[PDB]
């Protein structure tokens, strides 16, 4: 349809605020939608939504549309909002006096809260009408709107205050910046772990029994960088989950799966070396081939039971307004769990493996000083990294995970996500820590030439 250059700016504004979907999806009420929040129908029939879409677009879309087609739909919604604004004696005087950029901020509010909701801002609207930008920005910052949706409102208020697109220019610079850093993190995890996996499979010297456990670690960390970290990066750079409610449950399960398998494998490796370093002869006889494959299967079976079973059975769901809101919203994929799962998952994933690894590696330090310049220094710094890097990466998260479940207000969501990325970073550190043998080095060089 007819596009303008103003029209494209208000399109990119909400593309950032609300997201763009070029395929039919469901909104918070289960209603079929496309584009930037364009309701197709309240009918539960996907074909009926496809008929409404084809009538409006003028093409057999079969549910998929282009960006230009989404802008056609978007501009119609903007025209309707504007016609509403002009019929309302509370919004027309303010609207008529605003420049085009601040005029898009007001339309943004109406898309978020509705015409009636925005008309209740009597005093802020009067201040905007009188061009009292800083005073209007202060008053709006005190709003219920600001406290409910601070990031959205910071961007909109900056638009009222300055009349520019800087809040959205800055958001987009940040988005590309983190996307770079995320892709780097994804590269290190995948490369380092795929390098360890192939080194074991193409070298008979490396196919020992201890390194069979390290293959489990490298595999739990490989899925981490192929499925968990990449999709977890989409929530950071785009502020939303973009893949529907069903994939939010699966992603959440695959993450808890791999995090459980990875840490418990560090626990098995910690036990393995303890037996070989202390009682190497009973070690070589009791730990058979099938017993080593017995532990790894047990680790993964436990990991599936604590991830796919409770999450898909909705046992992990909290029952507050904040949690139920995120569950009904496909665009929300926050980790909001109840107290029981938050503790039970933390114990099975982190706290039990921490206690074993801490106790085991402490006793290796004990029996080393009993049977004594000395090389005890080079082995102590080694233990300091195996436990230091592990603890430093996951301890902040699993402290916040248990606390936040009881006191939701103490752990900020931003801080909570950050601690979870420290744990994500362990999947890159493990191949550096556990594959430092001369056999790996001769193999790693053999693969890269």
């Amino acid at each position: 349809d007819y596009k303008d250059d103003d029209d494209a700016n208000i399109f990119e504004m909400l593309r950032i605020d609300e997201g763009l979907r070029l395929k039919i999806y469901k909104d918070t009420e289960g209603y079929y939608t496309i584009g930037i929040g364009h309701l197709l129908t309240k009918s539960p029939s996907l074909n009926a939504a496809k008929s409404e879409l084809d009538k409006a677009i003028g093409r057999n879309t079969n549910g998929v549309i282009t960006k230009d087609e989404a802008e056609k739909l978007f501009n119609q919604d903007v025209d309707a909002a504007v016609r509403g604004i002009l019929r309302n004696a509370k919004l027309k005087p303010v609207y008529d006096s605003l420049d085009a950029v601040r005029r898009a901020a007001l339309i943004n509010m109406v898309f978020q809260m509705g015409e009636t909701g925005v008309a209740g801002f009597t005093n802020s609207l009067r201040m905007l009408q009188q061009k009292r930008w800083d005073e209007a920005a202060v008053n709006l910052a005190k709003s219920r709107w600001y406290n409910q949706t601070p990031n959205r409102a910071k961007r909109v208020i900056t638009t009222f205050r300055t009349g520019t697109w800087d809040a959205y220019a800055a958001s987009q610079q940040w988005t590309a910046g983190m996307g770079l850093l995320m892709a780097l993190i994804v590269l290190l995890i995948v490369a380092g772990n795929v390098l360890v996996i192939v080194a074991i499979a193409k070298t008979p010297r490396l196919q020992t029994l201890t390194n069979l456990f390290i293959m489990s670690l490298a595999s739990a960390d490989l899925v981490m960088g192929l499925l968990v970290v990449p999709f977890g990066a989409t929530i950071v750079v785009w502020g939303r989950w973009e893949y529907g409610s069903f994939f939010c449950e699966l992603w959440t399960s695959v993450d808890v799966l791999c995090v459980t398998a990875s840490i418990e494998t560090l626990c098995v490796i910690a036990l393995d070396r303890y037996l070989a370093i202390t009682s190497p002869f009973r070690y070589q006889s009791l730990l058979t081939r099938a017993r080593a494959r017995g532990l790894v299967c047990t680790v993964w079976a436990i990991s599936a039971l604590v991830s796919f079973l409770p999450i898909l059975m909705h046992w992990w769901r909290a029952e507050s307004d904040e949690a139920r809101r995120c569950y009904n919203d496909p665009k929300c994929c926050d980790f909001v769990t109840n107290r029981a799962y938050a503790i039970a998952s933390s114990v099975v994933s982190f706290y039990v493996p921490l206690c074993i690894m801490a106790f085991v590696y402490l006793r290796v330090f004990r029996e080393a000083q009993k049977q004594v310049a000395l090389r005890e220094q080079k082995a102590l710094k080694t233990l300091g990294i195996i436990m230091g890097v592990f603890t430093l990466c996951w301890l902040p998260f699993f402290l916040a995970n248990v606390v936040k479940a009881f006191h939701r207000e103490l752990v900020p969501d931003r801080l909570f996500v950050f601690f979870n990325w420290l744990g994500y970073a362990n999947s890159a550190f493990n191949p550096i820590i556990y594959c430092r043998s001369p056999d790996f080095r001769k193999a790693f060089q053999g693969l890269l030439c």
Epitope: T278, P280, Q369, L374, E376, A379, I433, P438
Partner: nanobody, 120 residues
């Protein structure tokens, strides 16, 4: 850096005895395995006696009873007091040391070897 000296080798008649001595210089980690390996012409390398820093032993069952391995208190040396020699024990005996300074893997120290032939 770390070198291990290898003494006690020689030729002897069937039924005699020997006493292999292996002294390892350099610094090593407190938990280790000092062992002896033999390779006869033809067949590949095999272990005979290993001794852990705690005291636990492991003797090849074709070799146990006749052979005894020991460690020195406050000395990085291993002694293989061997008796009741048989003509099937003609092999170069190697001194091996398992270093555990790096906790995740084993770090082998090998030796040059001492020839041992036993007369029919």
């Amino acid at each position: 850096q770390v070198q291990l000296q290898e003494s006690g080798g020689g030729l002897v008649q069937a039924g005699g005895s020997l006493r292999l001595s292996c002294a390892a210089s350099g610094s090593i980690f407190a938990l280790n395995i000092m062992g002896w390996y033999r390779q006869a012409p033809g067949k590949q390398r095999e272990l005979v006696a290993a001794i852990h820093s705690g005291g636990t032993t492991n003797y090849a069952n074709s070799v146990k009873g006749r052979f005894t391995i020991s460690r020195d208190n406050a000395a990085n040396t291993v002694y293989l007091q061997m008796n009741s020699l048989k003509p099937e024990d003609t092999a170069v005996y190697y001194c091996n040391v398992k270093d555990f300074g790096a906790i995740i893997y084993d770090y082998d120290y090998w030796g040059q070897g001492t020839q041992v032939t036993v007369s029919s």
